[PDB]
UniProtKB/Swiss-Prot annotation, chain A:
The chain holds residues 684 to 771 of 859 of the full protein. It comes from Homo sapiens. It is found in: Nucleus. This is Fanconi anemia group B protein. DNA repair protein required for FANCD2 ubiquitination. Belongs to the multisubunit FA complex composed of FANCA, FANCB, FANCC, FANCE, FANCF, FANCG, FANCL/PHF9 and FANCM. The complex is not found in FA patients. It is linked to Fanconi anemia complementation group B: A disorder affecting all bone marrow elements and resulting in anemia, leukopenia and thrombopenia. It is associated with cardiac, renal and limb malformations, dermal pigmentary changes, and a predisposition to the development of malignancies. At the cellular level it is associated with hypersensitivity to DNA-damaging agents, chromosomal instability (increased chromosome breakage) and defective DNA repair. Some severe FANCB cases manifest features of VACTERL syndrome with hydrocephalus. The lineage of its organism: Eukaryota, Metazoa, Chordata, Craniata, Vertebrata. The gene is FANCB. It comes from the Eukaryota.
Curated annotation (Swiss-Prot), chain B:
It is found in: Nucleus. Belongs to the multisubunit FA complex composed of FANCA, FANCB, FANCC, FANCE, FANCF, FANCG, FANCL/PHF9, FANCM, FAAP24 and FAAP100. Forms a subcomplex with FANCB and FANCL. This is Fanconi anemia core complex-associated protein 100. Plays a role in Fanconi anemia-associated DNA damage response network. Regulates FANCD2 monoubiquitination and the stability of the FA core complex. Induces chromosomal instability as well as hypersensitivity to DNA cross-linking agents, when repressed.
Curated annotation (Swiss-Prot), chain C:
This is Fanconi anemia group G protein. One of its GO terms (biological process) is mitochondrion organization. Changing residue 60 to P: In FANCG; associated with a mild clinical phenotype; disruption of HES1-binding; no effect on FANCA-binding. It comes from the Eukaryota. It is found in: Nucleus; Cytoplasm. DNA repair protein that may operate in a postreplication repair or a cell cycle checkpoint function. May be implicated in interstrand DNA cross-link repair and in the maintenance of normal chromosome stability. Candidate tumor suppressor gene. Highly expressed in testis and thymus. Found in lymphoblasts. Belongs to the multisubunit FA complex composed of FANCA, FANCB, FANCC, FANCE, FANCF, FANCG, FANCL/PHF9 and FANCM. The complex is not found in FA patients. In complex with FANCF, FANCA and FANCL, but not with FANCC, nor FANCE, interacts with HES1; this interaction may be essential for the stability and nuclear localization of FA core complex proteins. The complex with FANCC and FANCG may also include EIF2AK2 and HSP70. The chain holds residues 12 to 462 of 622 of the full protein. Keywords: Cytoplasm, Disease variant, DNA damage, DNA repair, Fanconi anemia, Nucleus, Phosphoprotein, Repeat, TPR repeat.
From Swiss-Prot, chain D:
DNA repair protein that may operate in a postreplication repair or a cell cycle checkpoint function. May be involved in interstrand DNA cross-link repair and in the maintenance of normal chromosome stability. Belongs to the multisubunit FA complex composed of FANCA, FANCB, FANCC, FANCE, FANCF, FANCG, FANCL/PHF9 and FANCM. The complex is not found in FA patients. In complex with FANCF, FANCG and FANCL, but not with FANCC, nor FANCE, interacts with HES1; this interaction may be essential for the stability and nuclear localization of FA core complex proteins. The complex with FANCC and FANCG may also include EIF2AK2 and HSP70. Interacts with FAAP20/C1orf86; interaction is direct. Disulfide bonds: none annotated. The gene is FANCA. It comes from Homo sapiens (Human). This is Fanconi anemia group A protein. It is linked to Fanconi anemia, complementation group A: A disorder affecting all bone marrow elements and resulting in anemia, leukopenia and thrombopenia. It is associated with cardiac, renal and limb malformations, dermal pigmentary changes, and a predisposition to the development of malignancies. At the cellular level it is associated with hypersensitivity to DNA-damaging agents, chromosomal instability (increased chromosome breakage) and defective DNA repair. A motif (Nuclear localization signal) lies at residues 1-16.
Length: 88, 56, 416, 205
């Protein structure tokens, strides 16, 4: 972990993942969000193989393009209660 | 005319109270952030995006 | 030769896992008990040879798999597995008698000689220790583990520290397959032992030492019913300390995360009773009645094997629709809502007596009151309700079907 | 046997509830375990020995974002969600205003209320405010409240009159309460033409 930045983990495994940077943000200890910064895109695949080898059995990974579904459902319901305030 | 506008207003303030109660459930982690909200909201959206804005 | 045995092993593991991830109740068990008999045969086949040094890692592996699969299908443990362990260790010794303790001691000295099969041996120790933790031999267990780590960890008489210190040896190199690994068992043991310890510390009545270990339970491999029970357990811990608002927090969390929400409603009942908010207590018990109507395994050492069946004094004892409905009608009569209590009483005694055709809702617990006492409580509630003719009929019916309780019967019959 | 027929109750044998009934039950369970919840007692239980002054820590400032961060931090401490805190707090401060002295209130109270209400609107906009929790903690108070307060809540949208009256347990109590407030209002609606404007607006509403 970085001391000045404890949301950030730096891989020191001396093979191929070396250099890679993760962050892990937990929320409702079922769900959580992982971010990978890799030096190429093959390291990202090598990493998700190794991860998927470790987790529990029913764990549904899903790549997030544009933020967590939790946030975007809020932003959509907001924009609807604004639209419907305006029609009121 | 007026009956039209009031008909619209009621059709709106039902979907409004619907979305509001959905927001409360989100605030309190009632429905649990899963999916069923997403599909519901994108149906109150689809409902209104049909004859959106007649312009007079 | 050895390659054939290895390859059969692997075939059988794959068959096991195929049934595990797919399959319905019948086809799963069919393929399972197939693989199982294959493994019996292969065990026996390997036990036919004098045990050269190069074979053992396969022998241990297979017996480990055999044990695991056996136990998972049986949904419980036995002593035949402990015998199988004794046999495997006997084998290890014949390579290089008394009891499990001295056997283990000599085996582990023979293993710190470094024949490299520790990625299997430590798993076998795991299973062994799983048997003992299922059978409550904690004194021998901690000593076994003291032997396992350096005996400088001698005064560490705690178990759970010792389980954490326990470090299975290898990254599990390219060896024959297995249904379960040493790490996934250390991860099962920490949560099982910490749960069981937290319930013992609760029932014995020290709900401050509980919280630590009952948090170390959720902070681990904690299946969603094990989590539900940890939350209820911490509701109980807080109720006993006199912190009802926190206990309400944990009970709402247990309701939310859980699909098995009886015991939470019970703990809410017991907490509103402790307080006094009696209408709330009654609504919780009303809910419990409704909640008792509503009701897969894996070929792998789970956590629900190393848990016991819960005691009576525990927060996790929940009766049967009969017992609970009786608890409702009793506690409604005590509170003084005799009309409601009597309705619940009639639907109780009907659910015990009229029921001949369907599935039987049993009589209530052995410490729970006796049949005649139940008729008594029923008649009392019915009088208190103001249904004297119905109380007369009930008492007369009881006396026709069958002391002190008869004297009481006449008393209540008078009061009718 | 005649005794039996009287003893016989016919709903004994039942079938498993369909699982939406299970969810409805569980929802009512959580509803119940929350209705009996208190936050003041919680601030006594977890943290050692409730007003906006507590969260904002002794009159530092009055800025929206500062107080919103306070709410978030308080909810972090308790492991409670933020929407309920915020509702209970707004209800506590409403209790304060509508207590401090007979239906129609007046102007400095209206100024405090409108300052609280623009913050309640901020809380709604940032999605940190359960409406139903708020309405419930209002009907808990029920005596402090004034009809002008709830009419301002309605018009400022924080709740609606329809959401209030449909979120009180005893429907009869609401009926009687209304009858009383409307009776005291039609009494107040000739004391002045100034107060008559607001009172006629809210009674037409």
């Amino acid at each position: 972990i970085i001391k000045e930045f404890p949301e950030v983990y730096f891989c020191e495994r001396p093979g191929s993942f070396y250099g890679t940077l993760f962050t892990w943000k937990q929320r409702t200890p079922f769900e959580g969000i992982l971010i990978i910064y890799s030096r190429n895109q093959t390291v990202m695949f090598q990493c998700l193989h190794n991860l998927i080898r470790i987790l529990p059995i029913n764990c549904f990974l899903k790549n997030l393009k544009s933020g967590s579904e939790n946030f975007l459902i809020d932003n959509m319901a907001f924009t609807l209660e604004k639209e419907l305030v305006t029609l009121s | 005319r007026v009956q039209y506008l009031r008909q619209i207003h009621a059709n709106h303030e039902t979907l409004l109270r619907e979305v509001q109660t959905l927001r409360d459930r989100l605030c309190t982690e009632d429905e649990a952030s899963s999916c069923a909200t997403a599909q519901r909201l994108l149906q109150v959206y689809r409902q209104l995006r049909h004859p959106s804005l007649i312009l007079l | 030769c050895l390659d054939l045995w290895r390859e059969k092993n692997d075939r059988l593991v794959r068959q096991a896992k195929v049934a595990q991830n797919s399959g319905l109740t019948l086809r799963r068990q069919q393929l399972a008990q197939d693989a199982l008999e294959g493994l019996r045969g292969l065990l026996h086949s390997l036990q036919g040879l004098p045990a050269a040094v190069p074979v053992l890692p396969l022998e241990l592996t297979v017996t480990c798999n055999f044990i695991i699969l056996r136990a998972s299908l049986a949904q419980g443990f036995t002593e035949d597995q402990a015998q199988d362990i004794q046999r495997s260790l006997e084998r290890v010794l014949e390579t290089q008698e008394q009891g499990l303790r001295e056997l283990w001691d000599s085996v582990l000295r023979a293993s710190c000689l470094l024949p490299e099969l520790l990625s299997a041996l430590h798993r076998l120790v795991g299973l062994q220790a799983a048997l003992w933790l299922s059978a409550d031999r904690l004194g021998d267990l901690a000593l076994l583990l003291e032997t396992l780590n350096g005996s400088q960890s001698g005064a560490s008489k705690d178990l759970l520290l010792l389980l954490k210190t326990w470090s299975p040896p290898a990254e599990e190199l390219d060896a024959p397959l297995t249904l379960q690994d040493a790490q996934g068992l250390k991860d099962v043991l920490l949560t099982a032992f910490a749960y069981r310890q937290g319930l013992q510390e609760l029932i014995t009545g020290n709900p401050d030492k509980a919280l630590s270990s009952l948090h170390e339970a959720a902070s681990g491999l904690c299946p969603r019913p094990v989590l539900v029970q940890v939350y209820t357990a911490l509701g109980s811990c807080h109720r006993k300390m006199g912190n009802p608002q926190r206990a309400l927090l944990y009970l709402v969390a247990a309701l939310k995360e859980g699909s098995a929400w009886g015991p939470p409603l019970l703990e809410a009942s017991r907490l509103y009773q402790q307080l006094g908010d009696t209408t709330a207590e009654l609504e919780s018990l009303e809910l419990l009645v409704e909640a008792l109507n509503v009701p897969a395994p894996q070929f792998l050492i789970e956590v629900e094997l190393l848990l016991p069946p819960p005691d009576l004094a525990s927060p996790l004892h929940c009766g049967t629709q009969s017992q609970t409905k009786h608890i409702l009608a009793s506690r409604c009569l005590q509170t003084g809502r005799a009309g409601d209590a009597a309705e619940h009483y009639l639907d109780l005694l009907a659910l015990l007596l009229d029921s001949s055709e369907p599935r039987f809702s049993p009589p209530p617990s052995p410490p729970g009151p006796c049949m005649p006492e139940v008729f008594l409580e029923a008649a009392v509630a019915l009088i208190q309700a103001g249904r004297a003719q119905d109380a007369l009929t009930l008492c007369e019916e009881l006396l026709s079907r069958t002391p002190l309780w008869v004297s009481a019967t006449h008393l209540l019959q008078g009061q009718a | 046997r005649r005794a039996w027929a009287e003893l016989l109750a016919g709903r004994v044998k039942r079938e498993k509830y369909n699982p939406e009934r299970a969810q409805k039950l569980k929802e009512s369970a959580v509803r119940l375990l929350r209705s009996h919840q208190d936050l003041n007692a919680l601030l006594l239980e977890v943290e050692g020995p409730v007003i906006d002054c507590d969260s904002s820590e002794a009159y530092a400032n009055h800025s929206s974002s500062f107080i919103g961060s306070a709410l978030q931090d308080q909810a972090s401490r308790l492991g409670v969600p933020v929407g309920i805190l915020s509702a209970g707090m707004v209800a506590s401060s409403v209790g304060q205003i509508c207590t401090a002295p007979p239906v129609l209130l007046t102007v400095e109270q209206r100024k405090k209320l409108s300052s609280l209400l623009e913050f309640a609107q901020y809380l709604l906009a940032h999605s940190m405010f359960s409406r139903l929790s708020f309405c419930q903690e209002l009907w808990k108070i029920q005596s402090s409240l004034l009809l002008e307060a709830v009419w301002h809540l309605h018009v400022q949208g924080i709740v609606s009159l329809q959401e209030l009256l449909e979120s009180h347990p005893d429907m009869h109590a609401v009926g009687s309460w209304l009858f009383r407030n409307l009776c005291c209002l039609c009494e107040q609606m000739e004391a002045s033409c100034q107060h008559a404007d607001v009172a006629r607006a809210m009674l037409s509403d």
